[PDB]
Design a protein around this ligand. Structure first.
Ligand SMILES: Nc1ncnc2c1ncn2[C@@H]1O[C@H](COP(=O)(O)OP(=O)(O)OP(=O)(O)O)[C@@H](O)[C@H]1O
Ligand SMILES: Nc1ncnc2c1ncn2[C@@H]1O[C@H](COP(=O)(O)OP(=O)(O)OP(=O)(O)O)[C@@H](O)[C@H]1O
Ligand SMILES: N[C@@H](CCCCNC(=O)OCc1ccccc1)C(=O)O
Ligand SMILES: N[C@@H](CCCCNC(=O)OCc1ccccc1)C(=O)O
Ligand SMILES: [K+]
Ligand SMILES: [K+]
Ligand SMILES: [K+]
Ligand SMILES: [K+]
Ligand SMILES: [Mg+2]
Ligand SMILES: [Mg+2]
Ligand SMILES: [Mg+2]
Ligand SMILES: [Mg+2]
Ligand SMILES: [Mg+2]
Ligand SMILES: [Mg+2]
Lengths: 264, 264
């Protein structure tokens, strides 16, 4: 008895990357579902007993330690931001991906504007170079796909002043991804906001877009020094680390806990 | 030369709880402002050199360790939630405090609905009792006040099954606030959502509302076991810990870093 698409979809939800269970074997659907369900219950019992940290939270904490230890100031800035920030980033009506809140606000689609404000303000107080980073939620309307979430988690680190070269930027990215054990290559790309970017690729998967300033947009933000920065999606890092087939396994969600289906 | 309200407001921004500087001394405004500015620059230089962690982020990590170590599963759930969750929590049109996103969504004003879903789902897999917690942003339209933010950070921990008594709930709260070094008392109050609550008070400041279930709302969420839970505002905990006069010092913001004005 062949499997329906609904049945295939259910078994894929319950299947984990570490499993070696074939759906196209001729085993009956209810027997495959029940076996997968029992393994996932066991996986959750082991997490609860020994490993009670959330993957996204744990990765945020790991990344935070890495950048604090390397001299970067940890920033926590608003997620609900002025809609005016969007036009001032030169996002001309990505502009269609913005989640609007009431009349004058939106959910941030990137961390960059808040971090530009911090760079400008902190340069009045802190010695050269200024090094800061943030990790937190960001929001984009997206087409349903294996690599995109509408609610995702960004890391953005940046530096302003001395040391703001492509060479140093690549070196930080290398040290960062070596710490996480993720292989990568850097490929040139372009962005309608920042211009030329350095894209950090794992296979076909874009982990990060990075930028070497200065750029003309800086004057709109009161920035007048060289700078570098890079933005990474944490759920994409987790997708790589755990070999997930769909980024939803990694997302904020009532539907998966650390890649294990909660629909048991 | 007396100080204007604008001048007073500027000096209050630059003043920290540890300062012993009188604005009503007769010192000229520009000399007071310049002295405060120089101390705040020094405070930020010391943070950057030695103490680069954000207060909200550091407190989230401290609380996370406390509850993981006590057997609670760390949850990270969506901040952007279905508007339908609001009516199902019996919030009948707090309903006016909700930030609406597009047509069918809103920014969560509490963590409770997501955690109720997790309790129900995890009870299919995990042994008794089920203990979970979340920390993260929540959103309420509020009047401008010393104790309220429109974007704040909630902790909610909860337990379902055995051990779900007022006695155990108070004991967890006591252990938690003793760990943070915050004195408190518990006072009865009422809530249009949950019914009777136990409110955790520091002086006149409400740190938490806690609830001993079960309650009739449980049937709407598939909950049929006893439960306990409590929700705490992290920025209010930081307000207490650091003696801030206004909770904005503690908030996600481009305007303060760890209680130090960024407008220097
Ligand atoms: N919708 C999304 N879901 C999950 N992660 C995302 C999403 N959008 C961006 N990211 C992550 O944020 C990083 C920096 O954002 P950027 O603006 O470069 O994305 P992007 O170039 O639009 O990505 P893509 O081309 O894959 O849509 C990306 O490299 C990616 O890792
Ligand atoms: N607008 C806010 N800003 C900061 N913290 C908040 C806010 N609303 C609630 N909290 C925190 O969340 C906890 C639990 O939420 P709850 O629904 O009990 O708040 P509340 O009873 O409406 O508080 P209040 O009466 O002070 O408005 C509160 O005890 C408080 O510590
Ligand atoms: N490449 C990432 C973001 C890189 C930016 C790094 N940091 C930062 O935002 O400050 C610089 C800056 C100055 C003026 C105007 C905007 C920004 C992305 O595309 O999401
Ligand atoms: N006192 C806190 C929240 C306490 C709730 C604890 N945990 C939880 O949400 O699950 C129980 C539950 C079951 C059915 C419907 C809603 C909730 C506040 O008022 O913000
Ligand atoms: K496999
Ligand atoms: K999500
Ligand atoms: K004082
Ligand atoms: K805020
Ligand atoms: Mg994109
Ligand atoms: Mg791209
Ligand atoms: Mg990109
Ligand atoms: Mg209230
Ligand atoms: Mg109250
Ligand atoms: Mg309350």
């Amino acid at each position: 008895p062949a499997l329906t698409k609904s049945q295939t979809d259910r078994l894929e939800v319950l299947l984990n990357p570490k499993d070696e269970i074939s759906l196209n074997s001729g085993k009956p659907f209810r027997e495959l579902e029940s076996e997968l369900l029992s393994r996932r219950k066991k996986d959750l019992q082991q997490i609860y007993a020994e490993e009670r940290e959330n993957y996204l939270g744990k990765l945020e904490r790991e990344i935070t330690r890495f950048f604090v230890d390397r001299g970067f100031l940890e920033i926590k800035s608003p997620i609900l931001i002025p809609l005016e920030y969007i036009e001032r980033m030169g996002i001309d009506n990505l502009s269609k991906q913005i989640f609007r809140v009431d009349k004058n606000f939106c959910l941030r689609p990137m961390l960059a504007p808040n971090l530009a404000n911090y760079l400008r303000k902190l340069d009045r107080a802190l010695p050269d170079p200024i090094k800061i980073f943030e990790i937190g939620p960001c929001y984009r309307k997206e087409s349903d796909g294996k690599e995109h979430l509408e609610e995702f988690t960004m890391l953005n680190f940046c530096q302003m002043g001395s040391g703001c070269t492509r060479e140093n930027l690549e070196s930080i990215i290398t040290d960062f991804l070596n710490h996480l054990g993720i292989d990568f290559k850097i490929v040139g790309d372009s962005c309608m906001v920042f211009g030329d970017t350095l894209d950090v690729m794992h296979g076909d998967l874009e982990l990060s877009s990075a930028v070497v300033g200065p750029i003309p947009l800086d004057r709109e933000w009161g920035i007048d020094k060289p700078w570098i920065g890079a933005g990474f999606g944490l759920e994409r890092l987790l997708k790589v680390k755990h070999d997930f087939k769909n980024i939803k396994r990694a997302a904020r969600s009532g539907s998966y806990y650390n890649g294990i289906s909660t629909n048991l």
